[PDB]
C-alpha cells in the first residue's frame, strides 16, 4: 500500500525504477509473479541492495555478480597499453646508444 | 520438488492454517485470476 | 526467466541459447589483437639487438 503511495509521485528516472523493483519483489502467487519476482530479486542483488535470503541466490545471483566483476577486471592489459607508450621512449634510448 | 507423495487415506500436516483469510472480486478461473 | 517446463524447450530453446553464448565467445582473438600491439614492442627489441 505505501509502495503505491510513493508510486506515481516519483521521478520517472532511477527512483521510480528502484521503487518499481521493490514492487516486483512484492507479489502473491502464480508462476508469472513468481518468475517476475525471481528476476526482480535478481536485479536487486546484482545492483547491491537485496542482501540475499540466500537459498539459490548465490549460484544464480552472487556467482553471476562475481562473474561480471571478473568481466570488470580484464584491464591489466589496458594498463599495459600506456607502458608501450612509455617504452617507445626506450626505443628513443635505442637511438641514444 | 517440495511436493510430498503422501500415499494413504486422510493424511496431512496440522500446519495448514498459515494462510490467512481474505476476500476479493469474483474470478472465473486461476488462469483468469492471474490474467 | 522462464525456467523451462522442458518438453521441447531444450532443443528449440536451450540449445539456441547455448549457440548464442558460443557466439558470445569468439573473443579469444580480440584478446589476441592487444598482444600484437604488445609484441610490436618485441619488434622494437629487434631494433635493440
Amino acid at each position: 500500500a505505501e509502495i503505491l503511495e510513493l508510486l506515481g509521485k516519483t521521478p520517472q528516472g532511477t527512483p521510480e525504477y528502484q521503487l518499481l523493483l521493490l514492487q516486483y519483489f512484492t507479489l502473491l502467487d502464480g508462476k508469472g509473479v513468481e518468475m517476475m519476482r525471481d528476476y526482480a530479486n535478481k536485479q536487486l542483488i546484482q545492483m547491491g541492495v537485496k542482501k540475499p535470503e540466500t537459498p539459490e541466490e548465490q549460484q544464480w545471483l552472487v556467482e553471476a555478480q562475481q562473474a561480471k566483476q571478473g568481466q570488470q577486471d580484464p584491464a591489466m592489459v589496458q594498463a599495459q597499453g600506456v607502458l608501450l607508450q612509455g617504452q617507445a621512449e626506450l626505443a628513443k634510448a635505442q637511438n641514444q646508444t | 520438488d517440495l511436493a510430498t507423495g503422501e500415499k494413504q487415506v486422510l493424511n496431512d500436516i496440522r500446519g495448514r492454517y498459515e494462510c490467512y483469510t481474505d476476500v476479493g472480486p469474483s474470478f472465473q478461473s486461476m488462469k483468469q485470476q492471474n490474467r
Side-chain angles (χ1 to χ4, degrees), chain A residues 1-41 43-97, chain B residues 3 5 9-35:
Chain A
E2 284 182 339
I3 280 172
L4 304 182
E5 285 293 325
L6 192 48
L7 281 173
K9 51 184 61 182
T10 310
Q12 304 299 329
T14 59
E16 186 80 36
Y17 213 94
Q18 292 96 32
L19 211 172
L20 174 143
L21 290 180
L22 185 54
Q23 168 54 249
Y24 272 121
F25 165 70
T26 57
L27 295 176
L28 294 175
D29 191 49
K31 306 303 180 183
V33 313
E34 295 178 6
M35 64 183 73
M36 303 312 184
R37 189 189 309 173
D38 289 342
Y39 155 97
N41 301 0
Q43 308 313 309
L44 294 172
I45 186 184
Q46 289 198 348
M47 295 164 184
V49 65
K50 172 60 175 63
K51 185 183 67 63
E53 278 170 321
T54 72
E56 75 194 13
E57 296 172 6
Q58 278 64 21
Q59 292 181 334
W60 291 94
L61 299 173
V62 175
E63 305 182 343
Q65 308 168 335
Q66 295 181 340
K68 209 184 293 199
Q69 295 164 318
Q71 159 151 335
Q72 173 47 237
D73 190 351
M76 288 300 292
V77 167
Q78 186 197 28
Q80 287 180 0
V82 83
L83 53 280
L84 42 297
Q85 314 169 348
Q87 38 180 13
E89 281 167 318
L90 272 176
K92 301 177 181 68
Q94 304 170 4
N95 303 339
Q96 295 174 343
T97 52
Chain B
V9 295
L10 304 173
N11 59 34
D12 54 341
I13 176 175
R14 309 303 169 270
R16 82 191 61 79
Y17 288 4
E18 271 60 359
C19 310
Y20 73 93
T21 70
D22 197 83
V23 291
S26 183
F27 44 61
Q28 293 291 334
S29 69
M30 298 156 280
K31 170 67 171 296
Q32 190 165 347
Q33 310 165 346
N34 289 331
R35 176 199 295 184

